Design a protein around this ligand. Structure first.
Ligand SMILES: [K+]
Ligand SMILES: [K+]
Ligand SMILES: [K+]
Ligand SMILES: [Mg+2]
Ligand SMILES: [Mg+2]
Ligand SMILES: [Mg+2]
Ligand SMILES: [Mg+2]
Ligand SMILES: [Mg+2]
Ligand SMILES: [Mg+2]
Ligand SMILES: [Mg+2]
Ligand SMILES: [Mg+2]
Ligand SMILES: [Mg+2]
Ligand SMILES: [Mg+2]
Ligand SMILES: [Mg+2]
Ligand SMILES: [Mg+2]
Ligand SMILES: [Mg+2]
Ligand SMILES: [Mg+2]
Lengths: 137, 142, 23, 74, 118, 71, 128, 86, 48
RNA sequence: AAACUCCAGUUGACACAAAAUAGACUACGAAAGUGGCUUUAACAUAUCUGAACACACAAUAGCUAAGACCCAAACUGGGAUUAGAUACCCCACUAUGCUUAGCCCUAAACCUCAACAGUUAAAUCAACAAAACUGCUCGCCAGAACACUACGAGCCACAGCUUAAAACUCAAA
């Protein structure tokens, strides 16, 4: 069968499986890529937390937290604590356009996890709160 | 017209960007005000043409899977070469695969670009690798 | 056009408002 | 330029003159300088094409009127 | 005028769904409406989660009620539906079939000069 | 163009983001582009159509929009 | 206002409208229509009460009657919408336009001007 | 928040190629205008500024589309000289 | 012509007497407003 | 174990705030303005012109009184910067932006194009803007600065708005 980039829809009968688990059962790696920090949490399909790592918890401080290599290190740390709990395949949900948006996913792979999907959940208000005024630089 | 100038007297002249025209040109001649515009806009058209070939599987199955993204495409004014830039990947191993297929594809792509009779005369395309800090991965190799 | 006439009116109205403020 | 060769031959055969090339500035209005004080200018100019290659009137149309030369033109 | 009531009902068994429809159609008649038809669009998953009357809903029964009523009945009916606990979401619109579609010859081009001028 | 015909309306929104396509992608005229837009907005808030994505049931319908996405 | 049971101006002269079901009479009455349909019945009532030819819609008499019906609708609108500045303008502009019409009717046909004032209940006033 | 998850803005990875999956997602979000929308929303753009930029963006597209059309039309004659020497 | 057409339709209109029968007669049926359009302007009705 | 924590991540509940995409559209309204959904009411005039003051409107800011308060944010405080920084940069927070009822009546309120009607032939036309003109009517203007000022008068305005000079001065503006 040809490859579909569209995820399997829950309730339909798909043939795709990962270690005998359906798409709806794969744990989720939630990456919050901010401009000055990156936070990574791996949770189960039932919303059970399994591992958490951020650049701040990995000994990065101030502007060093807002780097790709800092997020990559946080991903490796979250992968290690998650792999101990039985995680191999993860669904990645990244919100934000920070520097650790892509690098945080690299660290998850180097840590022994297999990414089966990528989801963006960057909050976009449909009209929402007034942002801060423009900067004069 | 708009604030963008369109008063050129020879607006009906046939634009002829070819390698032969450059040799048969007055050395005193200098580029006119709206002469750069045609170059700026012709280079943009080449960017459009190349981008579609990469994402359409009909052109090549190997090229389609690579999912190459063009960072920049700027033709030369000499009409001898064309500069196209594609974004590098993190994995140096993956970088080699993309460059190899692109290097061999370019020759066929040039003929595919000749299919567009409007741009039939396309100088050999130079698929430069840039935008991905190619020299940074090279430094790590050392 | 230049804003030199506006600038004259700009200073006149500023000095006037300040005079009223002081007195 | 599709007909430059044809027109030059027609002129030579009839014993007349042809100018199908890039018309230089002042050939008519500055002829004495370009050719000499005793140069005789044309008594009649026949245009087989009145427009130049940029789709503007051939400069010789205006310059023929300036020099009071009658013009025949398609 | 002629109205169309788009009615999403709480997912219930057949007996309670019929009682809700009867209770909803009777409310229309009590306000002077002449009910023309009742159409079942089927039970389906909602496009998103809807909270109604201190409950969360993921499925609902979609129904249509075509009816004529005085202009003053709409305000009273909208208020009636807001208090019915078995109604997830109800909207009253002017019936689309009343609006007659005007014929179209085609797509006339727009002058480019007007675009930048405008 | 009826707001209850969600199958038709879904053909003019982005599969991944639910964004309504401009007329340069849909090829619709001004009159139908407006009816489709108003129909989509009505259907979304009345409980007939999702807002943030194209309903997956309608992903295999005829592709009438001049937009190329995947790889 | 005309009774809600009043039929629409379009269906009042169709043959057999009095023998149809009561439900069909409700659907063709003012009760099931918008307010603009009630104003067409009001205009018809005044046109037949006042003007000599109720079918002449371009005469100065009919225009004063048509505009007087609009003016009454604006007054009712503003009774419920007292901060609606757009319609307050439409009301005042319509009153000014009617006064201009009444001025030209008084100058040209006084006998008809008297019937228009009596029929519509207008107390003509000379400007300051 | 109320919609189903893992449908919107979701791309599946093929053969472990996460870089190509990320590039496809970034291309999707770019084409739909989400990336530019997110960026413009970091600081409040004032209505007079938003209208000015939207007017500039719409007029630049028309001029660029019209300048492309002219170049395409006037490139038909880019063929070799048929009357060389004349 | 519009009054005649309307006079026949009123026979099928819901009423307080026939309300229960029509309510049940609707729960058994299904009305589908869905259909798709093609690049050629042809309607593609749903597979039901 | 335990309880505590301003805190952060996932999930759920959740507004008197603001209205992605469509909108590459150029619509509606007298203008100001108007871009989530529904409904009700509803967009003057079968010559034209016609007001600083009459009649009715009029962004934002601001005032009075009672509410709301997510977020933004004058002022203010703190942190930097700097020779100084009562600025630009960072953080916090208030008036305020919202609702209701009254006011206030100002904008580069600008298509910087008065309304209406007509013409594309004449000279096409100082320049630039936005091709050049005719008829008709109202408004307005007569060197610069003094001056969006003084005085007078009117105004729910009282550090306000509208109308609006003179003297001295200059040969320019
Ligand atoms: K919105
Ligand atoms: K006056
Ligand atoms: K302006
Ligand atoms: Mg001064
Ligand atoms: Mg007038
Ligand atoms: Mg006035
Ligand atoms: Mg004034
Ligand atoms: Mg105001
Ligand atoms: Mg206020
Ligand atoms: Mg506050
Ligand atoms: Mg705040
Ligand atoms: Mg304005
Ligand atoms: Mg006027
Ligand atoms: Mg003076
Ligand atoms: Mg002022
Ligand atoms: Mg004053
Ligand atoms: Mg005074």
């Amino acid at each position: 069968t040809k490859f579909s980039i569209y995820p399997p829809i829950p309730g339909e009968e798909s043939s795709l499986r990962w270690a005998g688990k359906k798409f709806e059962e794969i744990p989720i790696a939630h990456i919050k890529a901010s401009h000055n920090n990156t936070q990574i949490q791996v949770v189960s399909a039932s919303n059970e937390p399994l591992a958490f790592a951020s650049c701040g918890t990995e000994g990065f401080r101030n502007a060093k937290k807002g780097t790709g290599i800092a997020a990559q290190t946080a991903g490796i740390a979250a992968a290690a604590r998650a792999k101990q709990k039985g995680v191999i395949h993860i669904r990645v949900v990244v919100k934000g356009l920070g520097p650790g948006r892509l690098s945080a996913m690299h660290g998850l792979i180097m840590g022994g996890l297999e990414v089966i999907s990528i989801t963006d959940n960057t909050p976009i208000p449909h009209x929402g709160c007034r942002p801060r005024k423009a900067r004069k630089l | 017209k708009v604030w963008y100038e369109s008063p050129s007297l020879g607006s009906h002249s046939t634009y002829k960007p070819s390698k032969l025209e450059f040799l048969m040109r007055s050395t005193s001649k200098k580029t006119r005000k709206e002469d750069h515009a045609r170059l700026r806009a012709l280079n943009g058209l080449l960017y459009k043409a190349l981008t579609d070939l990469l994402c359409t599987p009909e052109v090549s199955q190997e090229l389609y899977d690579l999912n190459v993204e063009l960072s920049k495409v700027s033709l030369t004014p000499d009409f001898s070469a064309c500069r196209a830039y594609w974004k590098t990947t993190l994995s140096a191993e993956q970088n080699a695969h993309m460059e190899a297929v692109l290097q061999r594809s370019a020759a066929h792509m040039r003929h595919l670009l000749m299919s567009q009779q409007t741009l039939r005369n396309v100088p050999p395309i130079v698929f430069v690798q840039d935008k991905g800090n190619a020299a940074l991965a090279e430094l790590d190799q050392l | 056009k230049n804003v030199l006439k506006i600038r004259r009116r700009k200073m006149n109205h500023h000095k006037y408002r300040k005079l009223v403020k002081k007195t | 330029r599709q007909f430059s060769y044809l027109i030059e031959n027609m002129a030579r055969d009839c014993g007349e003159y042809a100018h199908t090339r890039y018309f230089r500035g002042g050939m008519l209005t500055n002829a004495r300088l370009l050719f000499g004080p005793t140069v005789r200018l044309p008594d009649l100019i026949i245009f087989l094409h009145t427009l130049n290659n940029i789709f503007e009137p051939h400069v010789a149309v205006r310059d023929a009127a300036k020099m009071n030369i009658p013009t025949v033109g398609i | 005028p002629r109205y169309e009531l788009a009615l999403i009902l709480k997912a219930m068994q057949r007996p309670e769904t019929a009682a809700t429809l009867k209770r909803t159609i009777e409310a229309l008649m009590d306000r002077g409406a002449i009910v023309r038809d009742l159409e079942n669009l089927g039970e389906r998953a909602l496009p998103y989660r809807i909270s109604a009357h201190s409950q969360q809903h993921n499925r609902g029964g979609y129904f249509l009620v075509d009816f004529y009523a005085p202009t003053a009945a709409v305000e009273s009916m909208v208020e009636h539906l807001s208090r019915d606990i078995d109604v997830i979401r109800g909207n009253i619109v002017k019936h689309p079939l009343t609006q007659e579609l005007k014929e179209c010859e085609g797509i006339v081009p727009v002058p480019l000069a007007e675009k930048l001028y405008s | 163009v009826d707001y209850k015909n969600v199958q038709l309306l879904s053909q003019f929104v982005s599969p991944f983001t639910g964004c309504i396509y401009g007329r340069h992608i849909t090829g619709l005229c001004g009159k139908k582009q407006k009816e489709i837009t108003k129909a989509i907005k009505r259907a979304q808030i009345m409980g007939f159509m999702p807002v943030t994505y194209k309903d997956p049931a309608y992903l295999k319908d005829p592709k009438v929009c001049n937009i190329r996405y995947r790889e | 206002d005309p009774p809600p049971s009043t039929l629409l101006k379009d269906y009042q002269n169709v043959p057999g409208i009095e023998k149809v079901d009561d439900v069909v009479k409700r659907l063709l009455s003012l009760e099931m229509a918008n307010k603009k349909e009630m104003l067409k019945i009001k205009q018809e009532q005044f046109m037949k009460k006042i003007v000599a030819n109720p079918e002449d819609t371009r005469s100065l008499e009919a225009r004063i009657i048509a505009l007087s019906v609009k003016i009454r609708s604006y007054e009712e609108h503003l009774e419920k919408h007292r901060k609606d500045k757009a319609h307050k303008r439409y009301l005042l502009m319509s009153i000014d336009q009617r006064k201009k019409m009444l001025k030209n009717l008084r100058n040209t046909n006084y006998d008809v001007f008297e019937k228009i004032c009596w029929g519509l209940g207008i107390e003509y006033t000379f400007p300051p | 928040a109320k919609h189903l998850k893992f449908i919107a803005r979701t791309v599946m990875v093929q053969e472990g190629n996460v870089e190509s999956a990320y590039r496809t997602l970034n291309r999707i979000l770019t084409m739909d205008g989400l990336i530019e929308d997110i960026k413009h929303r970091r600081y409040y753009e004032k209505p007079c500024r938003r209208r000015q930029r939207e007017s500039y963006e719409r007029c630049r597209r028309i001029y660029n589309m019209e300048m492309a059309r002219k170049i395409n039309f006037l490139m038909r004659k880019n063929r070799a000289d048929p009357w060389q020497g004349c | 012509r519009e009054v005649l057409q309307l006079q026949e339709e009123v026979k099928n209109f819901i009423t307080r007497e026939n309300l229960e029968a029509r309510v049940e007669a609707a729960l058994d049926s299904r009305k589908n407003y869905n259909w798709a359009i093609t690049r050629e302007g042809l309607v593609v009705r749903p597979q039901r």
